[PDB]
Design an enzyme around this catalytic site. Structure first.
Site, PDB file in Angstrom:
ATOM      1  N   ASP A   8       0.832  -1.180   0.000  1.00  0.00           N
ATOM      2  CA  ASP A   8       0.000   0.000   0.000  1.00  0.00           C
ATOM      3  C   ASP A   8       0.869   1.232   0.000  1.00  0.00           C
ATOM      4  OD1 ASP A   8      -2.325   1.391  -0.043  1.00  0.00           O
ATOM      5  OD2 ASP A   8      -2.859   1.081   1.963  1.00  0.00           O
ATOM      6  N   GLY A   9       0.320   2.332  -0.496  1.00  0.00           N
ATOM      7  CA  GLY A   9       1.004   3.625  -0.442  1.00  0.00           C
ATOM      8  C   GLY A   9       0.042   4.703   0.045  1.00  0.00           C
ATOM      9  N   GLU A  46       2.049   4.120  -4.247  1.00  0.00           N
ATOM     10  CA  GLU A  46       1.413   2.836  -4.558  1.00  0.00           C
ATOM     11  C   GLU A  46       2.277   2.005  -5.496  1.00  0.00           C
ATOM     12  OE1 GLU A  46      -2.712   3.856  -5.782  1.00  0.00           O
ATOM     13  OE2 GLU A  46      -2.432   5.475  -4.325  1.00  0.00           O
ATOM     14  N   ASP A  68      -4.768  -2.817  -3.165  1.00  0.00           N
ATOM     15  CA  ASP A  68      -6.080  -2.201  -3.398  1.00  0.00           C
ATOM     16  C   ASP A  68      -6.008  -0.959  -4.299  1.00  0.00           C
ATOM     17  OD1 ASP A  68      -6.645  -0.167  -0.364  1.00  0.00           O
ATOM     18  OD2 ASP A  68      -5.010  -0.209  -1.809  1.00  0.00           O
ATOM     19  N   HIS A 122     -10.089  -2.736   3.328  1.00  0.00           N
ATOM     20  CA  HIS A 122      -9.253  -3.284   4.394  1.00  0.00           C
ATOM     21  C   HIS A 122      -9.940  -4.461   5.081  1.00  0.00           C
ATOM     22  CE1 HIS A 122      -5.820  -0.900   4.110  1.00  0.00           C
ATOM     23  NE2 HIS A 122      -6.089   0.058   4.980  1.00  0.00           N
ATOM     24  N   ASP A 132      -1.005  -0.144   5.229  1.00  0.00           N
ATOM     25  CA  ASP A 132      -1.500   1.238   5.313  1.00  0.00           C
ATOM     26  C   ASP A 132      -0.975   1.965   6.547  1.00  0.00           C
ATOM     27  OD1 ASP A 132      -3.116   3.563   4.741  1.00  0.00           O
ATOM     28  OD2 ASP A 132      -4.551   2.818   6.209  1.00  0.00           O
TER      29      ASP A 132
END
EC number: 3.1.26.4
Length: 153
Positions: A8-9, A46, A68, A122, A132
């Protein structure tokens, strides 16, 4: 051969301070990666999360990559094919946005057998939730420079 990667970013603006989190699982053992940048964007973090995780792999693997990111999904499943045919330029003949990171990603993608798991929320994805937290924590304590970031005009 089987490696699971979760990424995740996150970033507080556009551009703004940002960070990534990635988890690399192999043989029930986990490795965590995380870093923050002083001036970057969400989309770049990301991509950076996936780049850093895949670059960690030292041998050809079968990877299950779980993220995601809508941006990364569209790029991977829609755009990149035609980007390469057009020599990494849009119809206006400008360099594709974030070409640096997309090309660096594509390099890492070519070395493995990758199954993409496009996550939605999530909820029920503890590893992504943790990526995250990592990303956000690094965005609050950024230390690196995202030298590839260009102020879009």
């Amino acid at each position: 051969k089987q490696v699971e990667i979760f990424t995740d970013g996150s970033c507080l603006g556009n551009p703004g301070p940002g960070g990534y989190g990635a988890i690399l699982r192999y043989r029930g053992r986990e490795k965590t990666f995380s870093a923050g940048y002083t001036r970057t964007t969400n989309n770049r973090m990301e991509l950076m999360a996936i780049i850093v995780a895949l670059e960690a792999l030292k041998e050809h693997c079968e990877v299950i990559l779980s993220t995601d990111s809508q941006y990364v999904r569209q790029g991977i499943t829609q755009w990149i094919h035609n980007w390469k045919k057009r020599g990494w330029k849009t119809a206006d003949k400008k360099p594709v946005k974030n070409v640096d990171l997309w090309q660096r990603l594509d390099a890492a993608l070519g070395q493995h057998q990758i199954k993409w798991e496009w996550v939605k929320g999530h909820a029920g994805h503890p590893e992504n939730e943790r990526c995250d937290e990592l990303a956000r924590a690094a965005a609050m304590n950024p230390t690196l420079e995202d030298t590839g970031y260009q102020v879009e005009v």
